[PDB]
Design a protein around this motif. Sequence first.
Motif, mmCIF file in Angstrom:
data_model
loop_
_atom_site.group_PDB
_atom_site.id
_atom_site.type_symbol
_atom_site.label_atom_id
_atom_site.label_comp_id
_atom_site.label_asym_id
_atom_site.label_seq_id
_atom_site.Cartn_x
_atom_site.Cartn_y
_atom_site.Cartn_z
ATOM 1 N N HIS A 1 0.803 -1.211 0.000
ATOM 2 C CA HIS A 1 0.000 0.000 0.000
ATOM 3 C C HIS A 1 0.847 1.277 0.000
ATOM 4 O O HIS A 1 0.323 2.336 0.316
ATOM 5 C CB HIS A 1 -0.959 0.015 1.193
ATOM 6 C CG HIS A 1 -1.952 -1.110 1.216
ATOM 7 N ND1 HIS A 1 -1.921 -2.102 2.172
ATOM 8 C CD2 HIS A 1 -3.017 -1.389 0.424
ATOM 9 C CE1 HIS A 1 -2.917 -2.947 1.965
ATOM 10 N NE2 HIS A 1 -3.598 -2.538 0.910
ATOM 11 N N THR A 2 2.159 1.189 -0.176
ATOM 12 C CA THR A 2 3.023 2.363 -0.217
ATOM 13 C C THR A 2 3.618 2.557 -1.609
ATOM 14 O O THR A 2 4.070 1.594 -2.240
ATOM 15 C CB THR A 2 4.138 2.261 0.812
ATOM 16 O OG1 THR A 2 3.563 2.132 2.111
ATOM 17 C CG2 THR A 2 4.992 3.512 0.777
ATOM 18 N N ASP B 1 -6.574 5.244 -3.816
ATOM 19 C CA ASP B 1 -6.924 4.809 -2.479
ATOM 20 C C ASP B 1 -6.129 3.595 -2.041
ATOM 21 O O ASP B 1 -6.194 3.224 -0.874
ATOM 22 C CB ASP B 1 -8.420 4.489 -2.426
ATOM 23 C CG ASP B 1 -9.302 5.700 -2.726
ATOM 24 O OD1 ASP B 1 -8.768 6.800 -2.953
ATOM 25 O OD2 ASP B 1 -10.551 5.532 -2.767
ATOM 26 N N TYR C 1 -1.459 4.170 1.075
ATOM 27 C CA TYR C 1 -1.693 4.830 2.346
ATOM 28 C C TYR C 1 -0.455 5.541 2.864
ATOM 29 O O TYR C 1 -0.555 6.297 3.835
ATOM 30 C CB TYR C 1 -2.170 3.816 3.400
ATOM 31 C CG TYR C 1 -3.189 2.804 2.922
ATOM 32 C CD1 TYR C 1 -4.295 3.189 2.196
ATOM 33 C CD2 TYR C 1 -3.100 1.475 3.310
ATOM 34 C CE1 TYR C 1 -5.233 2.263 1.784
ATOM 35 C CE2 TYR C 1 -4.051 0.555 2.919
ATOM 36 C CZ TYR C 1 -5.111 0.962 2.151
ATOM 37 O OH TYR C 1 -6.063 0.068 1.749
ATOM 38 N N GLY D 1 -1.951 10.554 2.519
ATOM 39 C CA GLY D 1 -1.247 9.484 3.191
ATOM 40 C C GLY D 1 0.065 9.975 3.753
ATOM 41 O O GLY D 1 0.499 11.070 3.448
ATOM 42 N N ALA E 1 0.143 1.280 6.894
ATOM 43 C CA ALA E 1 -0.970 0.598 6.244
ATOM 44 C C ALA E 1 -1.850 -0.110 7.273
ATOM 45 O O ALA E 1 -3.053 -0.295 7.046
ATOM 46 C CB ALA E 1 -0.439 -0.372 5.184
ATOM 47 N N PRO F 1 -7.106 3.649 6.786
ATOM 48 C CA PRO F 1 -6.824 4.685 5.788
ATOM 49 C C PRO F 1 -7.698 5.897 5.994
ATOM 50 O O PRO F 1 -7.180 7.019 6.008
ATOM 51 C CB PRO F 1 -7.118 3.985 4.454
ATOM 52 C CG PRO F 1 -6.907 2.561 4.742
ATOM 53 C CD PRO F 1 -7.348 2.343 6.157
ATOM 54 N N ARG G 1 -6.159 9.775 6.783
ATOM 55 C CA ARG G 1 -6.296 10.946 5.923
ATOM 56 C C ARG G 1 -6.910 12.115 6.674
ATOM 57 O O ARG G 1 -6.570 13.266 6.405
ATOM 58 C CB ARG G 1 -7.107 10.617 4.673
ATOM 59 C CG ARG G 1 -6.812 9.268 4.068
ATOM 60 C CD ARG G 1 -7.576 9.066 2.796
ATOM 61 N NE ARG G 1 -7.789 7.657 2.480
ATOM 62 C CZ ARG G 1 -6.937 6.913 1.791
ATOM 63 N NH1 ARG G 1 -5.785 7.416 1.354
ATOM 64 N NH2 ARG G 1 -7.238 5.655 1.549
#
Lengths: 262, 262, 262, 262, 262, 262
Positions: free
Chosen positions: D18-19, D51, D54, D102, D204, D208, D212
């Motif tokens: 997720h990065t 999306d 994160y 993020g 992560a 999420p 944000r």
Amino acid sequence: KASSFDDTHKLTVEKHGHTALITINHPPANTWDRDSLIGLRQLIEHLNRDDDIYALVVTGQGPKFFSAGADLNMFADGDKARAREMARRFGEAFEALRDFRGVSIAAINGYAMGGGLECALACDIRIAERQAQMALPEAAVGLLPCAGGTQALPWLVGEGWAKRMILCNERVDAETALRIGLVEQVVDSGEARGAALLLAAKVARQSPVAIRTIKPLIQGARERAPNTWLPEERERFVDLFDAQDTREGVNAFLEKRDPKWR
Amino acid sequence: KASSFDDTHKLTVEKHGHTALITINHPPANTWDRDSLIGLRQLIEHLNRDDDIYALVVTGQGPKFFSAGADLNMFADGDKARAREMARRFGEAFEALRDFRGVSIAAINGYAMGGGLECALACDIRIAERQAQMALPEAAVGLLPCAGGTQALPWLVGEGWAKRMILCNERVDAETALRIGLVEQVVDSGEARGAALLLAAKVARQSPVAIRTIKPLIQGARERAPNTWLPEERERFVDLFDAQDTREGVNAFLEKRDPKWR
Amino acid sequence: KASSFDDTHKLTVEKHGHTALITINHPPANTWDRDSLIGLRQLIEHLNRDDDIYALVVTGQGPKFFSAGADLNMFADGDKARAREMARRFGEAFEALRDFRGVSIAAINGYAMGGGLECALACDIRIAERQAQMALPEAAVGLLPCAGGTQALPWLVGEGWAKRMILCNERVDAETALRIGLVEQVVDSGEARGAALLLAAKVARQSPVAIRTIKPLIQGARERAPNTWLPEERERFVDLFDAQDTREGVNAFLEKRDPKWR
Amino acid sequence: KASSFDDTHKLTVEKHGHTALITINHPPANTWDRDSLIGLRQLIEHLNRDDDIYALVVTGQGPKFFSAGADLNMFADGDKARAREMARRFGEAFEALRDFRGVSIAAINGYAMGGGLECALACDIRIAERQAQMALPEAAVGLLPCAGGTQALPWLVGEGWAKRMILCNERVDAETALRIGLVEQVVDSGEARGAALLLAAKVARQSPVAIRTIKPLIQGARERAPNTWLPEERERFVDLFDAQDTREGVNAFLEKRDPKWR
Amino acid sequence: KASSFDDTHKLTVEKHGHTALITINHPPANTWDRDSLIGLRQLIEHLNRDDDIYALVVTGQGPKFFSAGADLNMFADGDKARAREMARRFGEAFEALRDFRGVSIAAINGYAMGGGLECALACDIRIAERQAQMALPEAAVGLLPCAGGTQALPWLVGEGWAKRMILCNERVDAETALRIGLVEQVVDSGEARGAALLLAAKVARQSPVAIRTIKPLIQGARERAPNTWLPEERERFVDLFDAQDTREGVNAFLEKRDPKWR
Amino acid sequence: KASSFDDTHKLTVEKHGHTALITINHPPANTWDRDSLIGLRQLIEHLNRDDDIYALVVTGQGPKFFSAGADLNMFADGDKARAREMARRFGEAFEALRDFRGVSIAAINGYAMGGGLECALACDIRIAERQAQMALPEAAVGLLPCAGGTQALPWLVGEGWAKRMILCNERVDAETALRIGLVEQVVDSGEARGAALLLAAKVARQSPVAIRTIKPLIQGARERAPNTWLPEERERFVDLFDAQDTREGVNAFLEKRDPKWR
């Protein structure tokens, strides 16, 4: 209201319904003094604690002048300390009045100048007789308005109109003040007191708990930007709902009847 | 505009030229409801994305209510969770409309009170028929305006007048409102919409790209002190200048002809 | 003052008593140029240094226009480097006038729009002839006001009216301007210059030391919230009292003679 | 992310879990370029739309330079337009980086000076190799940091230290920076990327949606006083609760099992 | 203190000298409860009224937990109303603690996480045992800190360190906190309470009236920019000077004897 | 500097290169006095006019005392007037030092307490001798710091550490001060002046025009939030670019040679 405490006889308080009537009683010009300033700050504190009062009205004793501003003796020469301490007292007293939880209406039954006008500016609403003339003349003697005059006057009427009175030392009639927004309403001579009380009675008709919380929101812009208060506005709104008194107002409208609260 | 997404039948948008006309369609008072609030925010987001629209007009269906304010069913006693959420809806919805890139005009053809006035306050410019009356009556029921009324009204008309309407629950006719600065212009009954569409059509005659950028600068004072924005103003001006569209508006003036942009 | 340095012949300054008269003299519309902007900023600095001058008056040469705004040569396409530089010059020049220690009065004898309007807004007080028309037309050509207009106009007249002139590109007569508070006073044609000089004479009658200190406080609201300035307002007052000049102003009123200062 | 869009080959984006990993590739000093600045702002927007990501990690190509700072080519004499335009991109570029929803992690693998230090400051968290040295040397050449360095450096490390670097042109080793709060963590050489990526995997694990929303609140102080955000903090908290994701996180701790969200 | 009052049995108040000792006693993790939060606010108000108390200390019952924060039963799903109400309670109670006129010392004898950490931050000074670990784990469950944590943590430790704890869910030992400035002092296990009481006694040696007035000034930056508070600092100094209590302190240093005040 | 100016015997100014060395010369404690406060403000003003000075260093005569704080005679009981005036000079004097365009370096050669510490805080950078001890003891005497100490100390070291020194009246050694961020560097006994001057020689190496303009940006956060200044930072950057001196520095780095300016 204020029936039991050490209050200067110069200020007389008469309670009408839920409205507390405060009159400056200093002859012959109703000039402000250290004793009255102390009484006012104390009075506002006492009145705030009282839950039976929802509105306050301030008027000048006598027909000619609501307030002549600060007394000459206070600014008597040869003492620097005195000027400092007394600037403090005006601010404390006027800010306390500005901070009154209930609605404050000033009935200008005569011309309001210097401190007198600054006092009226402290009140939420201003009602003036046609003959009264209002101005800040401190600049003429080399002194600025020290009761919050510099901030308060531009706020209501704008900087340009505020500048002409203080900078150019020009007084304004009731018709002018109403036109620029300095005074919300204009009244026939001698009717300011009754109209103020009449209006203060209308204030009693709105929920006490609601009035007390709403007034800070309106005046929040002075401390801070308006957009910042928006989250708080919803939050305050939620706090009201968590009250017995709140449910009464909405129900009364739904059933077409007068709301009744405690 | 807003040709296809699930949009509440209560809100109808019709496209004339570069202006989108939004009317509250809730009988009989057009009172606001949760479904309308959701749609309004969604409608604003969709409108911002559309580049063919330069102006927005909102009016109340029928000749009697721009808006009746919040529906009582929405605030029916006495569940606290609902109250918190409806205030949240108002803030987002009104703020979204307030933040519309294009100019927003509210045409007051009917009674606009409570929530309705707050909505009109959200609009950049307000046009009202002579018969319409506007006030915030939330204080009478013990509820504060949660739509930004507490900030918006004093900003437009000043604190003294704002307190009188909300704290004293005092409605205003079209003449007082124009005088106090609440409404920019006054129109004959039934002419608000025609006047609104007419004024909105002229705005389409100004550079699209300019209008979206210029509106934030004017509303900058609400977030922060005016003086802080001066550097940003020059930087946004030059950002306008490094565009093809900016060269056209200036060129048109030199050659004395109507500017033409996308 | 200002007769011993390099000052553009376009700007002519005449010293009358304690009032310095500044006239824009660029034909045919008195449009601002780089040479004028530099002179204005330098002029204000020299004027501040002079202790004989208590009031400032600005007027447009010729009957028809006070000021045309920025010169067209000043914004010729397509160079960006200059545009950045001219915008900087306006801000510097306008802020210097806005911060002039003495009172600044703008006499509007002709149409004042764009930069010219921005110039008047910088001035403390505005006096206009009945015929003069004021508007910000930069948006029509895709240019925002770069002289602080986005901040200055809503401050005086409120966002709704301010948005109308800039966003809708609508001009206002002297009468509307007086109603909206854009102008403090309206005068007969050709008499604005004489009236402004006369009003400037009133400023001489107030203590110089007071006027210079007082002017920042009133404008404190722009930099920060008004309430923040209250402790400073008392502090500056004590400073005024610690002078030979201040004691003369107060004492004169007690013996009801005109104050005499140096 | 950034798999199929027009982006400069100087900047390479690698998606791990997720990065999204972004690496500056400018030889030999990894200095910023107009192409780099544009790609950065465009990229950040694209990451914000995605999306699936994160967390964000920034690293400098090659062992020696994290970011050479500004290229001489950009500030090459003597065009004035060039300089104004280029400062604008740094602000746009860094602010976009600063505003990534993020988390942004700056891994200092090499020399970070001038623009490079400013870039790292834009990053939420900084991890540095023991050898790397960072400073702002623009004052030596007569240039101020235009990437927000003047505000960002003082905020993290205090006025005394920040002035010393910028005003006194004094570079700092990893150990000194960690002592002063400039860098949160210090790592052995070449382990920065792994540690930054590994730290990014931890993020992560947090919701999420929560992440944000929370990050702007922390950064609220830079725009306004901390206390001002307090009402809004409670409001956004309730906004989190009306979400499917919040109920799962709250539920997950109770079961003592890892939370599962989308 | 507060013996003749209704406080939750969980909160224990012990008075030593002028220092009032409050212990959270909620088993088994000393997690906050509604009954506890109201008492805390109430307790603070009673303490503010009493002039016999110059210092405050808060510690967690038992060696293991200073404070665990909000209980899940308090935040138990699925009602939205429960969360809005508890968020208000944390803010009110913690803000009350933050506003205690006397100095508040937080003695960390156990795990301080979530609300517990927020509670510690609300205290002026923090003393921790080496073993205690402090973090905000709310993000892991998808909930932000609603006690002012988002503002309080970056204020003490800076954004970078603050972000890692909240965003990355990273707990910190006593030593790391001391290095980052989260805790003023580190103490050997079990000595936090004694040290806090001993530190609290030292505060008694400074003037009570001075302490109450001075404390808001230090915290003025949270409300507003530091620079704005300076005129007030001078004003309050003069107010202190106009009191007998102030003359005693000056006398004591002059004759080299211990100051004695009521 | 101060080559031909009227200064009290007590401040000694020696010009070393571009650095002006100011030494307090009051026996035996180097305590501040009314005469020195005026000289400080005037000296700062004169130093500001001189273009040959790029740095400033402040130290106390004798090894033992950088500054004893305020003189006992100035705050001698009991005139209220004296105390108000004395507080006023501290603010004007210290702010003037705070506002020096060139860099200010404080060499703590002796005990720095009360006013002395506040004086040091006005300086940009502080260098201290290992034996020197710094504390604010005014609370013990019932007086608050009137030199901005309330604002200055929490800014550099944070609220928690600030509160203990002032509220708990606790003094800190150099290792403690350096650790908490109070002082940038710790020096061996007696080398503070040499180290200060040496560090002051470094600022001469940086462009004078950049230093003067950059320093307000760093200190902009005190007046207002940091994000507010970002647009202006760009604007000031561009203003520097419009200077002969700016082109010279950038060149030297390209040609790898020492920059030379006037």
